[PDB]
Design a protein around this ligand. Structure first.
Ligand SMILES: C[C@@H](c1cc[n+]([C@@H]2O[C@H](COP(=O)(O)OP(=O)(O)OC[C@H]3O[C@@H](n4cnc5c(=O)nc(N)[nH]c54)[C@H](O)[C@@H]3O)[C@@H](O)[C@H]2O)cc1)N(C)C(=O)NCC(F)(F)F
Ligand SMILES: C[C@@H](c1cc[n+]([C@@H]2O[C@H](COP(=O)(O)OP(=O)(O)OC[C@H]3O[C@@H](n4cnc5c(=O)nc(N)[nH]c54)[C@H](O)[C@@H]3O)[C@@H](O)[C@H]2O)cc1)N(C)C(=O)NCC(F)(F)F
Lengths: 140, 140
């Protein structure tokens, strides 16, 4: 079971999320990201089990990354599905802030509002190695 | 003196450029990117000199990356300046295509139109490892 699951938006967070996978793998962590570890079968099943098997949940807060979550009242958006699982299993959630504006809780679905209550890490283009060291201090 | 100079747009390519840095150093290339290796002094000469010392010139073509070069007569846009140096020095230009649309050459200033004649490498989120290896094979 991989120890770090990376959840992100294919849209605005694909590059950071891959740059995080590499960096954590360089420091020895076993990393799940979809385009490399999501393999055969029913992905709904397997993605949820990958969040369930990972002690660490790294969530890439790229600009507008929770917009598709807002008014996803039937829990059919995939960042929404991943966050709820992580909160449900008590995972060490670690958000990564990259030009992300914090929603008010009320605009998000109730089952994922708790994600705003975790200390996030601001991504610094100018000080990436320090940001990586900080992200790794946060990992368990 | 570094072997590889990375040219990029801070607002669209900052992540892929940093992703390219980490991977290339991993493979043992000495990589120049401004955030890590631009240092004291007048940047307008430190920058041009570093393009001149690197055999390889890697150009991150994120979306819109050459836009601010358009109509830049007096060569004051930095992507424009870095590109013209690579062309005038006969550098090993390896463009990286990240959702970039090829402009018609005549929208670009005359002194960088030739940059379009080089073989670009398409960045594949799904096949990042394959993409990195192809980049290495292009490098001298
Ligand atoms: C459903 C989709 C998916 C997987 C993981 N996630 C997690 O949820 C977050 C990202 O979600 P996003 O909201 O940012 O983007 P999306 O919702 O649009 O994703 C779906 C989009 O990909 C394309 N698309 C759709 N269907 C398939 C498919 O069968 N096969 C392939 N190759 N592409 C497919 C299409 O373009 C579509 O629109 C992340 O945290 C993921 O971990 C979300 C969605 N999926 C199965 C794959 O990708 N499989 C390839 C991979 F990942 F294994 F390499
Ligand atoms: C002029 C600027 C620069 C350097 C290299 N390049 C190459 O040219 C391409 C970039 O393309 P861009 O179109 O994005 O450039 P820009 O005009 O937008 O940059 C302006 C933005 O940078 C910030 N800004 C501006 N002025 C300073 C400054 O004195 N001091 C610090 N700390 N930040 C500064 C600010 O945020 C601003 O708004 C790349 O290929 C670079 O290699 C372009 C511009 N510069 C000196 C730095 O950055 N130095 C910090 C560094 F790079 F060492 F980390």
């Amino acid at each position: 079971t991989p120890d770090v699951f990376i959840s992100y938006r294919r849209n605005s967070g694909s590059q950071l999320a891959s740059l995080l996978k590499v960096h954590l793998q360089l420091h020895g962590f076993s990393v799940f990201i979809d385009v490399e570890k999501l393999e055969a079968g029913k992905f709904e099943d397997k993605l949820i089990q990958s969040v369930m098997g990972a002690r660490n949940f790294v969530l890439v807060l790229s600009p507008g990354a929770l917009d598709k979550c807002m008014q996803d009242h039937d829990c059919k958006d995939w960042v929404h599905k991943e966050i709820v699982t992580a909160l449900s299993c008590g995972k060490n959630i670690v958000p990564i802030i990259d030009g992300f504006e914090w929603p008010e809780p009320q605009v998000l679905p109730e089952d994922m509002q708790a994600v705003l209550t975790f200390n996030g890490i601001k991504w610094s283009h100018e000080y990436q190695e320090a940001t990586i060291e900080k992200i790794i201090r946060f990992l368990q």
